[PDB]
């Protein structure tokens, strides 16, 4: 297997690969989250250099993880699908073993844990 340590420390104490991943997020379309008294609203930018788009079938920016939780994102679109898939599987796995849907904190903690695992695993960025 490909083992290379891609995410590593630099002399100044930075992990450039993680910081360059943030630059990819900074490039991505803007996404905003605002929570009210009895609701949360997820706003998302869609760049208008793309005309002739088919908005019916184009992947939506906001994704349902379960019937009660949603996930929006900024950065690499292809990468987001992998996190969303893992989150959706974990959501059903939680209902199966705990007989209760995930809390938003738990789901976030899981997704965050996946992202972290890719910052100190060999062969991955």
């Amino acid at each position: 297997g490909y083992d290379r340590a891609l995410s590593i420390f630099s002399p100044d104490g930075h992990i450039f690969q993680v910081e360059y991943a943030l630059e990819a997020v900074k490039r991505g379309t803007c996404a905003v989250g605002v929570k009210g008294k009895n609701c949360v609203v997820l706003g998302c930018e869609r760049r208008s250099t793309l005309k002739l788009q088919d908005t019916r079938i184009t992947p939506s920016k906001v994704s349902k993880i379960d019937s009660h939780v949603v996930l929006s994102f900024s950065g690499l679109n292809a990468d987001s699908r992998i996190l969303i898939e893992k989150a959706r599987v974990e959501a059903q796995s939680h209902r199966l073993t705990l007989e209760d849907p995930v809390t938003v904190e738990y789901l976030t903690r899981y997704v965050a844990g996946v992202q972290q695992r890719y910052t100190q695993s060999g062969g991955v960025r």
Partner: protein, 195 residues
């Protein structure tokens, strides 16, 4: 686990499943629901080996629910039944097979038709107007052959179902403690509380 029945009528599918859970010489429970909702318009009843039944049903349920979230779309009863059959078909040649027999009652929203599938633990799928698993069939099939009509209403189907339960209660050796009846139609799944 013993008695599970299914009757497809004009506009709905009706599933009746016994309430008794027996272990040894003791009826441990008399209010057991031997069914899981796979999707808003698809219901699966089950019967067979202890432990395997619920483990299998919930495993299927989780997979169908995962699909629904991923595609934001409900799978057709036919698609669900094929998925379930394949899982049982894999299972039968495993190290330890699922010894579970199922009925899948669903309402196809695209076709606007009720659909009843009978699948045994070997992965033997058949679409039927009425179905049963276990010894129940040996009484109900002949009874339904006689009294069943394809254009029946949901209410007529319930009366037809009452006739089956009465016959089973008369001639079956074991006390199965009545049945939970559920109806699957265009408006989804609901339970008949007084049967």
């Amino acid at each position: 686990m013993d008695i599970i029945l299914g009757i497809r009528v004009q506009d709905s599918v009706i599933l009746a499943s016994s309430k008794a859970v027996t272990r040894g010489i003791s009826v441990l429970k008399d209010s057991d629901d031997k069914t899981r909702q796979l999707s808003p318009h698809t219901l699966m009843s089950f019967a067979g080996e202890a432990g395997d039944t619920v483990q299998f049903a919930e495993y299927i349920q989780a997979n169908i629910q995962l699909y629904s979230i991923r595609e934001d779309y409900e799978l057709s009863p036919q698609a669900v039944s094929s998925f379930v059959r394949q899982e049982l078909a894999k299972s039968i040649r495993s190290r330890r097979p699922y010894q579970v027999n199922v009925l899948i009652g669903g309402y196809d929203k695209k076709k606007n038709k009720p659909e009843l599938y009978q699948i045994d633990y070997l992965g033997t799928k058949v679409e039927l107007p009425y179905g049963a698993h276990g010894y129940s069939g040996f009484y109900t099939f002949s009874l339904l052959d006689h009294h069943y009509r394809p254009d029946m209403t949901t209410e007529e189907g319930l009366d037809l179902l009452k006739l089956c339960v009465q016959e089973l209660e008369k001639r079956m050796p074991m006390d199965f403690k009545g049945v939970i009846v559920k109806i699957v139609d265009k408006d989804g799944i609901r339970q008949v509380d007084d049967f």
